[PDB]
Amino acid sequence: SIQTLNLDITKVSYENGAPMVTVFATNEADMPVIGLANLEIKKALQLIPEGATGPGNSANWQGLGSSKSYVDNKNGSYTFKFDAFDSNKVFNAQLTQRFNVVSAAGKLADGTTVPVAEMVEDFDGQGNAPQYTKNIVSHEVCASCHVEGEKIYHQATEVETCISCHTQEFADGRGKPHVAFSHLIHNVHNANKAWGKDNKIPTVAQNIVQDNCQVCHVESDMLTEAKNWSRIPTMEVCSSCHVDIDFAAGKGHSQQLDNSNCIACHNSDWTAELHTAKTTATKNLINQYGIETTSTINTETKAATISVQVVDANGTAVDLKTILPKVQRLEIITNVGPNNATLGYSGKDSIFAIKNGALDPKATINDAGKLVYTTTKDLKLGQNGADSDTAFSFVGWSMCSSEGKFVDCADPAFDGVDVTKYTGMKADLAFATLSGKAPSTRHVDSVNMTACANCHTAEFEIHKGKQHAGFVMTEQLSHTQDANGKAIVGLDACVTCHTPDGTYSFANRGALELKLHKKHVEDAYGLIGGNCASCHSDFNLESFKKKGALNTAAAADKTGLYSTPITATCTTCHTVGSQYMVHTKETLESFGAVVDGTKDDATSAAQSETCFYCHTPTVADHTKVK
Ligand code: HEC
Ligand code: HEC
Ligand code: HEC
Ligand code: HEC
Ligand code: HEC
Ligand code: HEC
Ligand code: HEC
Ligand code: HEC
Ligand code: HEC
Ligand code: HEC
Ligand SMILES: [Ca+2]
Ligand SMILES: [Ca+2]
Ligand SMILES: [Ca+2]
Ligand SMILES: [Ca+2]
Ligand SMILES: [Ca+2]
User: Fold this and answer.
1) Distance between CA atoms of 44 and 57, rounded to whole angstroms?
2) 3 state DSSP class of 536
């Protein structure tokens, strides 16, 4: 019923001794919410300033108590009192005061569902606006990866709440420096030491965050202490990833008995630059060059000719001969039928037109300076309906590089394993038709690269390594816009290899409709759970009408097994015969499905599934049935 619960602390009065704190609660339509039964001041705190506990030391939140004692004022406002405020007798009205207010998800008496809500607000010692703050990060950055509104590890859903409990005082009281939040947060994302009573090595977190400070530390003229990540070096925080130094013993570093001198040597400019230098340099290299690609079909040979034009940052022609010795790889993959690929993985046309500065004999650089290549595999154009009139070609490429500069590829046999020696560049996509009519294109309206980049960054070099140059996905291969006129960067090019017939093995669930789900349900569940909205804005259920069979298994003789397309898509996570699927194979067949059968049988029955008579999935709730 209630979609968003907003909370504001509207009044703080110390006239009776302890503070009386009034909270106003509204819904998404700014209407007052009456009847909250689980509202609480989870923490009352005050701010010991930067350096007060010692030179170079951080500011600290000192505890003043908590309260679940409030009156519902029957107008959207609620007033708290404290039964035992400041039991430690440390209250100081010269300090900034903070209140952390939480409302548990649940149902108002009338049965109205109410979602969780959390907030903090800061004041001076009389309830006016605060004079100074410790605002370094905000909850929004975590939501780029962790599902907004769900608990992050435990206890709460917003970082300010974690920060309000995991304080220096908290850590000191337990004799455990590592549980102070500014140590913990880096610890749990970095694999140099394990964490928890379970000794978990953060392998997955490390591979996503990659120690990149800017995924959480965003400079902003909203958070006045945002630059603290580089301006306040301390042994307590810096040791979270730098785990082998003993400052006390003077091992692996000069002896430092306190934090008095860290900033004198570790100046802010240096700390900020050093931790961000590699990603900054890589992003600079990626944006040095681009490509613009065309494809045409020879109406008589029915082969496709792909032409690639390198351009500079201003989009000005660069003759490929001039940078050829620095091109590490350029690869071109062509399939047919962008809505239901027809050639399979084994039947696709593919070539490394360039490897380590050298042109393949099948590719040439023409007099206008473009690379030109003509397909050699049977593209079977027009052999499978109107969609098969269209060939689509994916171009990926890389340039050799060292320490932020492009360099010559001096080793023709360089295998691409050492990713520090080259940079994947912006990939491209080109369409051509046998008929000469406009090309068909795949829907790109349900998932796009912007969603992938929330976790992997915009500079994600997909598949970079021994097997591929690294595909960087950008507006270069956009062919449509959203309702707002923003270019959509689709993943439709990936279908060149991620075909309905699978990838190199029929046991991989390689089709694109299955592969992203399989990889992420297996390895990203700790982050995403069942949150389809992590990737999807919508489900394009109409797209199923353009699909045929999808490969779902390998037979014992290693031949391919296939399912009708809706069943195939759902069963990636809901394996037939497992505890994750109630419908038996017999029942699914009674709904028109083919389950791990022949390609012919699955193709014939592809538009015979009755699943959507009952199932009405939306991204908000994919489990919905009539
Ligand atoms: C906000 C969403 C968070 C997050 C991300 C974490 N916490 Fe807590 N936490 C609390 C207590 C009493 C402990 C045990 C400490 C001990 O071992 O003595 C923890 C522990 C953790 C861990 C494990 C850290 C480790 O190195 O072992 C982690 C990763 C963690 N928390 C994350 C208590 C609280 C709260 C008290 C009201 C609040 C709020 C939070 N935690 C919030 C969060
Ligand atoms: C105050 C207690 C600190 C803290 C928290 C750190 N330092 Fe230093 N440090 C200095 C030099 C010349 C180096 C080597 C530079 C380099 O490797 O490029 C370091 C190294 C570090 C590290 C990184 C350790 C690593 O090998 O990765 C860290 C995390 C670190 N320091 C923290 C020089 C100085 C000083 C000059 C006399 C002073 C004082 C400090 N550092 C103080 C601190
Ligand atoms: C948008 C549809 C995409 C695409 C194309 C990819 N991702 Fe993710 N990803 C996430 C996590 C936690 C992992 C596992 C990391 C690990 O186990 O070390 C992955 C893995 C991948 C890969 C494998 C290569 C790699 O970098 O590990 C690939 C190719 C890939 N993904 C593509 C996390 C997320 C998200 C967090 C909510 C989001 C969103 C995405 N990924 C989105 C996409
Ligand atoms: C992507 C660049 C992330 C951002 C931004 C934040 N987190 Fe994260 N976190 C991320 C991953 C891939 C993982 C590992 C998940 C897994 O299955 O291993 C984590 C892990 C944590 C943890 C430990 C719990 C765990 O699941 O291992 C915590 C406590 C945590 N993250 C907290 C957290 C906070 C508070 C963030 C905002 C400051 C935050 N993370 C951002 C990826 C990313
Ligand atoms: C999210 C997964 C983070 C990443 C990646 C990095 N930092 Fe961080 N840092 C994060 C949080 C939630 C906090 C606590 C903020 C608070 O209000 O308490 C911090 C804190 C720091 C600090 C302490 C600043 C202070 O005033 O004491 C430092 C020095 C710091 N972080 C440094 C730092 C560096 C150098 C990083 C890249 C290697 C980095 N952080 C990444 C969250 C996250
Ligand atoms: C994990 C999120 C880290 C935190 C917290 C801190 N550092 Fe760091 N540090 C980290 C990485 C991944 C690297 C390698 C950077 C590179 O690309 O070379 C470093 C490196 C340093 C260095 C240079 C050491 C070297 O190998 O040449 C220094 C001097 C350094 N870090 C200092 C430093 C300080 C002062 C920190 C607290 C403010 C700090 N680091 C935190 C990862 C992480
Ligand atoms: C052929 C040149 C490919 C293109 C173009 C793309 N991918 Fe790929 N991918 C390919 C192979 C041979 C494999 C391994 C076999 C398998 O099916 O798993 C993959 C694998 C993936 C995975 C899984 C990764 C894992 O660690 O398990 C993902 C998530 C994936 N591929 C995604 C993906 C995307 C988004 C692409 C377009 C940018 C893409 N692939 C293109 C081969 C090829
Ligand atoms: C990113 C890791 C994703 C998550 C999380 C979820 N889905 Fe997804 N989905 C993803 C991709 C790359 C594709 C292929 C798009 C294409 O061009 O083939 C899909 C596809 C679907 C579909 C097919 C309809 C469509 O919109 O294309 C469905 C019905 C679907 N996905 C459902 C679904 C559900 C129910 C999810 C949460 C449990 C979910 N997806 C998460 C990527 C990702
Ligand atoms: C992984 C990306 C999934 C895809 C693809 C599909 N579903 Fe799903 N589903 C997924 C999860 C993680 C869960 C929660 C499991 C649990 O803990 O209970 C679900 C759940 C459902 C349900 C509710 C289960 C029940 O009580 O019956 C339904 C009805 C459901 N899913 C339907 C469904 C359909 C029709 C799908 C294809 C369009 C589909 N799911 C795909 C994960 C994933
Ligand atoms: C009505 C006669 C249905 C038809 C036709 C199909 N499904 Fe179904 N399904 C139905 C119900 C009532 C449920 C349970 C809902 C709940 O909330 O408990 C389901 C469940 C599923 C699931 C989730 C399974 C699980 O998590 O255990 C999936 C993935 C699913 N159904 C898929 C599916 C397919 C592929 C269908 C067409 C072949 C199909 N369903 C038809 C009701 C009905
Ligand atoms: Ca207020
Ligand atoms: Ca909030
Ligand atoms: Ca760690
Ligand atoms: Ca283009
Ligand atoms: Ca039909």
Assistant:
1) 22
2) strand
Tokens of 317: 């022609």
DSSP 29-87: TS-B----SSEEEEEEEEEE-TTTTSTTPPPEEEEEEEE--EEE-SSSEEEE--SSTTT
Q: Which residues are annotated as a binding site for Mg(2+)?
A: 187, 190, 193
**How far is residue 474 CA from its own chain's centroid?**
16
Structure-token match 């199923």, residue found: 544
Q: In 192-326, at which residue ranges do the beta strands (DSSP E only) sit?
A: 290-297, 304-311, 317-318
Identify residue 305 by its one-letter amino acid code.
Answer: T
Taking CA atoms, 78 is separated from 16, 28, 125, 129, 617, in Å, by 17, 18, 21, 20, 38
Residues 275 and 208: beta-carbon distance below 8 Å? no
Which residue has its alpha carbon closest to ligand 8 atom 40?
Answer: 532
* Whether residue 318 has its Cβ less than 6 Å from ligand 6: no
Please tell me the distance between residue 24's alpha carbon and the centre of ligand 11 in angstroms. 9
Under 8 Å between Cβ of 511 and 550: yes
Q: What resolution in Å is listed for this PDB structure?
A: 1.8
Q: Which atom of ligand 6 is nearest to the CA of 232?
A: 38
Residue with tokens 């590890």: 153
The partner residues of 41 in beta bridges, in order of sequence, read 67, 101
User: 3-state DSSP call for residue 246?
Assistant: strand
- Can you tell me which atom of ligand 10 is nearest the CA of 566? 35
- Method by which the coordinates were obtained: X-ray
Provide the β-strand partners of residue 433: 390
Structural contact between residues 75 and 61, judged by C-beta atoms closer than 8 angstroms:
no
User: Quick one: which atom of ligand 10 is closest to the CA of 569?
Assistant: 35
Closest ligand 7 atom number to CA of residue 509: 17
Whether 211 is in the pocket of ligand 6, judged by its Cβ within 6 Å, is yes
Backbone angles phi, psi at 431, to 5 degrees: -110, 150
In the structure encoding, which two tokens stand for residue 286, read together?
């990626």
Residue of the nearest CA to atom 43 in ligand 8?
535
Pocket residue to mutate for ligand 3, from 209, 212, 455, 498, most atoms within 8 A of Cβ: 455
What is the C-alpha to C-alpha distance for residues 573 and 518, in angstroms, rounded to an integer? 7
Distance 359 CA to ligand 12 centre (A): 56
Contact 422, 401 (CB under 8 A): yes
